[PDB]
Amino acid sequence: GAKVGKIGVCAMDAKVLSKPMRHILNRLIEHGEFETVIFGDKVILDERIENWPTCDFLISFFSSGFPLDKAIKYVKLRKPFIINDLIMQKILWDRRLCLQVLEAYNVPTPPRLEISRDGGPRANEELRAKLREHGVEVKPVEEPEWKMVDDDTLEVDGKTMTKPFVEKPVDGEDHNIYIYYHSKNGGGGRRLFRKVGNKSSEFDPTLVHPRTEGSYIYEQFMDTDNFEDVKAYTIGENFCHAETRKSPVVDGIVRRNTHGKEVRYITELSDEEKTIAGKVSKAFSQMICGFDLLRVSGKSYVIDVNGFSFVKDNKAYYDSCANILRSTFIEAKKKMD
Ligand SMILES: Nc1ncnc2c1ncn2[C@@H]1O[C@H](COP(=O)(O)OP(=O)(O)O)[C@@H](O)[C@H]1O
């Protein structure tokens, strides 16, 4: 087809060189409709933003090492069309802000309490203004009054939650999540952790009281269908792919194939789950977005939003992603031209 324009990919090379990124970009360039503009780690890290290459349609997202604030300044200067808002990617780092945004868009989440000891989330004025556009005010908060009423019951400022419950650090990149079981289901708890992406856990019969340093979310432990979690992958508000995986929260067991990769099964989404997926993409202004959902006997709850995430090794996903990006960019060009 006729040339539509230039797709810039402003992300770390580790992500730009992924199989999905290469195969999706190849689909977009192979009929002559788009040209790719490569940034590269040396330019991103060491060159001034006024010297970064420019494009019409920009794909850009954070991963470890990416200078997000610098990329935000580039977008402010050059104003390409974007599909994943960069400023909103900052909120993925604070579970409290993510939950505030989900709530503001009527996305169901598990019951929770919060014990913040850090004064609340931090945000500069640029992030505050972006959040206001998403229905969220960033508020200072003091440490609440709290206690364990008994071994099974947490109280925070007069509201209670009964075990089992899940204690998550407010840092969205800290996966040291603790599960606290009810005494009548054997009590104790389980510490989940990650070792260079490798998930593990350990049962401790004595884990009973919350951590006393740090800031945490306490979510009701949901009894999920088949003890699984759903990994969902959006491409805008009207496309979502989903897979189940076994959760370790009950028994510590993760299922892996012989190559060490977590076993996953493609699953069909209900209409309600498709609606939730569209809401997550919209709420975070992330066209391409991964999130985790829990299925509990006919109800679904979002527990995490991970931001830019492709499905790997699925030719239909690659085709659909190229087709949807193509249509999106054609429309974006029409609006400008
Ligand atoms: N409220 C909850 N109820 C039940 N399971 C939960 C809840 N919150 C988190 N989980 C589970 O705890 C595990 C650890 O969470 P996390 O580290 O965020 O997983 P992931 O690496 O998939 O983001 C996951 O299996 C997730 O499904």
Author numbering: 184 to 520
Question: Can you quote the paper on this entry?
Answer:
Inositol pyrophosphates (PP-InsPs) are eukaryotic nutrient messengers. The N-terminal kinase domain of diphosphoinositol pentakisphosphate kinase (PPIP5K) generates the messenger 1,5-InsP8, the C-terminal phosphatase domain catalyzes PP-InsP breakdown. The balance between kinase and phosphatase activities regulates 1,5-InsP8 levels. ScVip1PD is a phytase-like inositol 1-pyrophosphate histidine phosphatase with two conserved catalytic motifs.
Therefore, we expressed and purified the phosphatase domains from S. cerevisiae Vip1 (ScVip1PD, residues 536–1107) as well as its N-terminal kinase domain (ScVip1KD, residues 186–522) in baculovirus-infected insect cells (see “Methods”). The structure of the ScVip1KD was solved by molecular replacement to a resolution of ~1.2 Å. ScVip1KD shares significant sequence and structural homology with HsPPIP5K2 and with the kinase domain of S. pombe Asp1. The C-terminal α11 helix of the ScVip1 kinase domain (residues 498–520) is well defined in our structure.
